[PDB]
Amino acid sequence: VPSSPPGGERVGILGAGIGGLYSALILQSLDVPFEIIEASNRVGGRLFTHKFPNGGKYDYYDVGAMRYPLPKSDDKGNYQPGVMQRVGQLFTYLGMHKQLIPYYFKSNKSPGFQYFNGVRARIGEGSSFDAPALGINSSLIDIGVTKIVNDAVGPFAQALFDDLQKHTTTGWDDMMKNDAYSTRSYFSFKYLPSPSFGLPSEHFSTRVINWLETFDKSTGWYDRGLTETVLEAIAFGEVGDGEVDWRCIDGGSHVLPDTIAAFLHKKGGNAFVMNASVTAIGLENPNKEDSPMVVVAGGQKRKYSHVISTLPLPVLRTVDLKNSKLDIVQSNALRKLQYGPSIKIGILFKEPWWTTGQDKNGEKFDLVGGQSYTDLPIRTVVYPSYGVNTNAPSNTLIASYCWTNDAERMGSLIGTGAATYEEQLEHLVLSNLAAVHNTDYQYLKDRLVDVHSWDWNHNPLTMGAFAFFGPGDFQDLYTSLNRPAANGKLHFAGEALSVRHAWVVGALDSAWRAVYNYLYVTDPAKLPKFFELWGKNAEWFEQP
Amino acid sequence: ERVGILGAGIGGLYSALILQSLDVPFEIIEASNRVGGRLFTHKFPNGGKYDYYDVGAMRYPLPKSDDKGNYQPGVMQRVGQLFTYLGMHKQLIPYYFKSNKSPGFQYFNGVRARIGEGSSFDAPALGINSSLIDIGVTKIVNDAVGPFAQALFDDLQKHTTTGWDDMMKNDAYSTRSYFSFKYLPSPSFGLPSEHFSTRVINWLETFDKSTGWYDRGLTETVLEAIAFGEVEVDWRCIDGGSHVLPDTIAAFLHKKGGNAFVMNASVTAIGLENPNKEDSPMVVVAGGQKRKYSHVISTLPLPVLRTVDLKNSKLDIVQSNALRKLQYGPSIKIGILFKEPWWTTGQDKNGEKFDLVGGQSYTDLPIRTVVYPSYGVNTNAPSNTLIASYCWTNDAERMGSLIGTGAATYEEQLEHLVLSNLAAVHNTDYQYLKDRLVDVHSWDWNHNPLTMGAFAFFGPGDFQDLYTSLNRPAANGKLHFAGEALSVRHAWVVGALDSAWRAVYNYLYVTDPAKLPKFFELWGKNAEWFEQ
Ligand SMILES: Cc1cc2nc3c(=O)[nH]c(=O)nc-3n(C[C@H](O)[C@H](O)[C@H](O)COP(=O)(O)OP(=O)(O)OC[C@H]3O[C@@H](n4cnc5c(N)ncnc54)[C@H](O)[C@@H]3O)c2cc1C
Ligand SMILES: Cc1cc2nc3c(=O)[nH]c(=O)nc-3n(C[C@H](O)[C@H](O)[C@H](O)COP(=O)(O)OP(=O)(O)OC[C@H]3O[C@@H](n4cnc5c(N)ncnc54)[C@H](O)[C@@H]3O)c2cc1C
Structure with missing residues (x-):
């Protein structure tokens, strides 16, 4: 009308x-x-929630937006200053504060898995993932990727966070003076390690830079603007002040x-x-x-x-x-x-095996929420934080969540309309899940019920995942x-x-x-x- | 064994x-x-002998050859020998990289011109100095890539690897970061002795290649300059696809x-x-x-x-x-079968003949590139098939989302977008092309499990x-x-x-x-x- x-x-x-x-x-x-x-x-x-018809109340998953790093709030819906404050107030303005349930960025029980270069470990075990065979010095491994990247983006991010607090634009001005850099070209031509690290004051090699990208982000991320890398650090709460309160919406x-x-x-x-x-x-x-x-x-x-x-x-x-x-x-x-690409693959299983199951050796997964990371094609696994501690916990898993090149490549197996490729995709995903978690392929296949895949880079209504x-x-x-x-x-x-x-x-x-x-x-x-x-x-x- | x-x-x-x-x-x-x-030729079932188009490979910058299949040294020599080894030399027909008659079209920033008319395409409104416009994108890019390419071309002639060693010393550069941090224009151009700004770099990318190309390795831009023969080449395609x-x-x-x-x-x-x-x-x-x-x-x-x-x-x-x-990189192609080779025989809304035989037309519109068939010309039944779109990098990622949807509604949206852009590039009414359309075939190499990308x-x-x-x-x-x-x-x-x-x-x-x-x-x- x-x-x-x-x-x-x-x-x-x-x-x-x-x-x-x-x-x-x-x-x-x-x-x-x-x-x-x-x-x-x-x-x-792009707030798109898919409900599996053969599932329960919490057998859904968000194809687009799923997690929100909101500032701390009182029980009445008032949010403290912060990047995502405007979002928190919108939830309160619509009477949704009571629907904002916790989102577990890390596993609420046992840590998630990391599987790189055939080396399997849990987040926090300080594994090197065979980095010495790649040529990565021993000093770099001890410092860590998180600590190195945070040292390079810190100064820029801190200046932008000051703009938000002090109501200035100087931080943006300095950021824009460096906008001609990609994250890669900044490491190759400008960045020098902090003196506290005890490293040589020299630019990183390509081998070291690609090593940072592998554990820090996605394949090809660092070839895009340095400005994007600092902004994503501020949104994720990697360099701010007030503690972040991860939340998702009950029901998607x-x-x-x-x-x-x-x-x-x-x-x-x-x-x-x-x-x-x-x-x-x-x-x-x-x-x-x-x-x-x-x-x-x-x-x-x-x-x-x-x-x-x-x-x-x-x-x-x-x-x-x-x-x-x-x-x-x-x-x-x-x-x-x-714009950038992205794909997600949601699988409905017979049970939350990641929470209650066990690997080939009897070790319990004991994963509640959180994420697992790997260099296999699926890159990221996201376990449901919604529905935990309920009569009907979620049986739905985000078996794959990719960005940049990992999403471009995987996308070719999505939406093909061919039975052969729907099965290849399923076998590939379960095979990567099988390796990341140390289980046989048949252990997961016996528990599979339904698969749902989505490629935002082949969606005519978005023509890409996001800017x-x-x-x-x-x-x-x-x-x-x-x-x-x-x-x-x-x-x-x-x-x-x-x-x-x-x-x-x-x-x-x-x-x-x-x-x-x-x-x-x-x-x-x-x-x-x-x-x-x-x-x-x-x-x-x-x-x- | x-x-x-x-x-x-x-x-x-x-x-x-x-x-x-x-x-x-x-x-x-x-x-x-x-x-x-990726040697994929699509034949329209409702077409004639030459109503096909190459979804993948279509043109080969081969070195000059005699009448018996012997090819002189060159980048593509190995290909020429393969054609002779298979008795195909007589099947290598001319490929027209430029129009065999009147030049192709250029349509940038709403300004339409023909290749060679030296149009600025309203660049001054973008902030591009008059000195840059006079030098030209082709002349600037050749000045930045020349040194690298010449060193690699000497490796091939003199049988050395020093040129490659020097190329690898600069492989950490993207083409963009090379212009932003290292390249200085040759003094013969009369430009200021300083690196190019983002505005100028994107202006170079717009007319030199595709959206987002310059964000990838500088080495790739140098190698593609050698493959295209930017260093004489005898362009050829295969009769029949x-x-x-x-x-x-x-x-x-x-x-x-x-x-x-x-x-x-x-x-x-x-x-x-x-x-x-x-x-x-x-x-x-x-x-x-x-x-x-x-x-x-x-x-x-x-x-x-x-x-x-x-x-x-x-x-x-x-x-x-x-x-x-x-x-890897993406790429898409859209081939359209028409009732007639309107690009060769037709005329625009103002009566001016297109007069295009082979060659290519360029634009900043979503289709980016148009390729007119060089095969079948001078035959009883010339080709009625046009490559209405041929994109790379970001232009292919965006267009790819409109391809392969399997939905009739969006296949028509795509067709309307392509014809509408062809209409603007050539200065014709949308209906002029629609009345002549017969069939459409689109392909997105970045959505194909057998390649998972167009190429490295x-x-x-x-x-x-x-x-x-x-x-x-x-x-x-x-x-x-x-x-x-x-x-x-x-x-x-x-x-x-x-x-x-x-x-x-x-x-x-x-x-x-x-x-x-x-x-x-x-x-x-x-x-x-x-x-x-
Ligand atoms: C995989 C993924 C995960 C994400 N995760 C998060 C997260 O955890 N947290 C978070 O905060 N954000 C997240 N985001 C970001 C968030 O989803 C988007 O930033 C936000 O939804 C964008 O809203 P918008 O209105 O700008 O665009 P969109 O939501 O894309 O809306 C555009 C609208 O325009 C319509 N449209 C398109 N073409 C036409 C046309 N020709 N005519 C008319 N209408 C048209 C579309 O159908 C759509 O309705 C994520 C995004 C992606 C892709
Ligand atoms: C759009 C486009 C335009 C091009 N234009 C030109 C041009 O003008 N000139 C030029 O010289 N070159 C051109 N090329 C390049 C040329 O087409 C390729 O470089 C060449 O054909 C690649 O040959 P290949 O054997 O490396 O790979 P491919 O030809 O891809 O062969 C790989 C084979 O492996 C098969 N395969 C895939 N997966 C599996 C599997 N799991 N198990 C078994 N088999 C499998 C595939 O079906 C295929 O048969 C173009 C390429 C593209 C994409």
Whole structure:
């Protein structure tokens, strides 16, 4: 159904993701008419939860967002300052604080497994994983990958964390002076070990750098922007102050967009336009000063005063933006600003063998939540933290969670539609799970029930997992999209338009900035109420 | 004594030719029902003789040749000799890298021009100085890569390795980081003596190659400059599609010695029957049945080996990591069959004739590259098939998501996007092309379990740290790694030939060195070093 603009203002939100839904909450709280246009048959976008039909209450897994490193909170839903504060307040604003259950980043019982170079160990046993055979000095092994990488990113990350506390941008300025570096080129040409390590003051070799990447991140991560590596350290809480409180949503992250879709309806009506793929955006007349915006979605023209686009950048490259009058830098930013891939494989088993089972030698796994890591194709294993300590614990496992090259390669085995490749994938995954945990292949096969795989890099609605900028992207093209187009009536938003890529808070920040520019240009009288309800700044810290 | 060749690609078929010429028993194991691997030609069933297009290999920058199949020295000499060895010289028809008549189109930043008109494509609005625009991207990139390429080209002529040694000293650079931290423009350009900014570098990448290329190894950019002949080359393609090469080699093998192919057999495990016994054979679990061999030559792409069980192959720790870290690149192609060769005979919305015969058109729109058919021209039935899109790196990752969905709704979205971009690049109405469309065929090599990527595309440091590990054998010297990845001519057929040459060389060296003179005499004294 069509909406209605009291005062002549109707905002057209493109995309029913968390970014678009957040824009709706803000506009709805400010008595601004809006309309959400969604290409698919569902809302939530990359908050995608899959429920196995042959499972119980907690036999699901999040294909997209699953964990949230929130600041500490009281029992009433007030969150302390922090990177993810904006997310925590959104949960409280929707009455979801009681649904935020603990997420165990590390195993709540026995440590998770590490399996690299044929060497199997548990996290904390200080194993070398045969690094000496690779040529890694003995001094490096004793220091550790976590300690070395933290020393290189620390200075940058600390400066950005100071921007958030002290309300400055100098930290970003210094970061941008180094944005031309990839994480690799920074280690190869700039980084020098801290004197406290007792190492030679010299740059690392390729062998050492690839050794850092292996245990620190994913294959090919370090070839992308250094800026991304520092930002991901801040989001993960690797270099901050206040302790982080990992949380996930009871029932899957899909509860968040579902609750927001109900909140937006309880007041008035339904402002969603589903199954309508935006094919063109632009001013009705680019020369007229007060021309509205036209959004051709689902083959039907729709008029709006302003448009807030949460579409991922590769999708805008498929939309006709002729009459949107983007400048030459914004046009190029849509193409060059890089995205990253990712795949997830969820398997439903007959039992939570990882919690109660045992290996070939009788040793109990005793894993509750947490993760296991390996250099095998599956790279990462994530055990369910939801449903533990319940009548029906979860039988669902994330048998694979890959990034960058590991996701690009594995993706070819996903979504093929061929029976042969669905079985190859299953045998490969179980085989890697079998090696990582020290069990026979048949032990897991006898417990398999259903398999679900997803490749965000082959999804036409996202065209990539998330933004993952390469070197120089932030310093040359990011700013162009932070200002509007189409005579100020087209606002770019989405997780890509933020410094928290691959996080929900990034989508929220982009919506905040989009509404801020909208109110600033149409109804500045609402800025005080806007600041009071949604914050004075997107990112700079502030008390609840 | 019997060698097990894994993979019926051009690399495996070449290994078979060599072993067959040296009277060495072999057996080819192929997972699919076809031979040629990435030599993939698609024939539209509703088309004519030349209504096909090469999904993989399609063009070959061969050295100049006489009328009897003798090729002068050059990077692609080994390929030319293979065509002659198979009696295919008369089938090598011209390939037009540039339009054989009027130049191809360029469409960047909304500015449309023809190749050669020296358009700036509105670069001044991007901040590109007038001095850079006058010099040009081609002239700048050639100035930065020239030194490296010349040193490597001298290695091939003078038979040395000093050039490669110098290249490896700089392998830690990506092409981007080289411009940002080391490169200084030649004083002859009249530019400031300082490294290029990000804006300028992305401007170079936009017109020189594909989105995201410059984030990968500098070495790869230098090697691809040598393969393309940027150092004269005689571009050629195969009459009827590149599939003729593997098909012709399969016939050459079925007549002499009988058939020796094992099709529809997916290799799932490789290793010694007993890793402790000194003279243990190699076992290859293919199609669920064990097969014994004396030596195994694997042409499987590196990501595929990561899905094979190599427990009893006794790889060292560097080889294990090389399989994972050695990076591959993506690529997609979209071939469209039209009612007529409108690009050759049609006209735009303003009446101006396209007048395009062969060649290529370039744009910053999602399709990036358009390739017009050079095969079938000057025939009763010229080709009506167009390569509407040919992407690399990031352009392929994005487009790939719209390919292979299996859903009719999104296959039409893709078709509308492609035709719409073709409409803008050529200055025609969308309906002008739609009225002439007949069939569409798209392929995403980054979504294919038999390749798991288009080809090797190493990142910084891969050549200098991990490439060597896979060039030595495993499994007590009974497992030899081959394929285009194991070469310095990635994404080229000659690279697969070089890998096969080196694999056979090590095999003969360790089992029957008495055959090395015949091996050298028939297939060359070196994989890469030039010869007559
Ligand atoms: C594997 C993975 C794991 C993640 N894990 C976490 C985590 O643990 N914690 C966390 O905080 N974040 C996580 N994230 C990030 C989070 O999921 C995203 O950052 C956030 O959901 C992005 O929201 P958005 O609104 O910007 O984009 P999206 O959610 O992608 O929304 C875009 C919307 O636009 C629609 N659309 C697309 N094309 C069109 C079109 N042509 N016309 C109209 N509509 C269109 C889509 O269908 C979708 O509804 C993860 C992401 C991934 C990929
Ligand atoms: C888009 C594109 C364009 C190209 N264009 C050109 C060009 O213009 N000129 C040029 O010279 N080169 C070009 N190339 C390069 C050329 O096509 C390849 O370099 C060459 O064909 C690779 O041969 P190979 O034997 O190394 O691998 P492949 O041809 O991939 O052969 C591997 C074989 O192994 C099989 N196999 C896979 N998995 C298994 C398994 N588990 N068990 C058993 N068998 C298995 C495959 O089916 C295949 O038969 C191009 C490549 C691409 C992708």
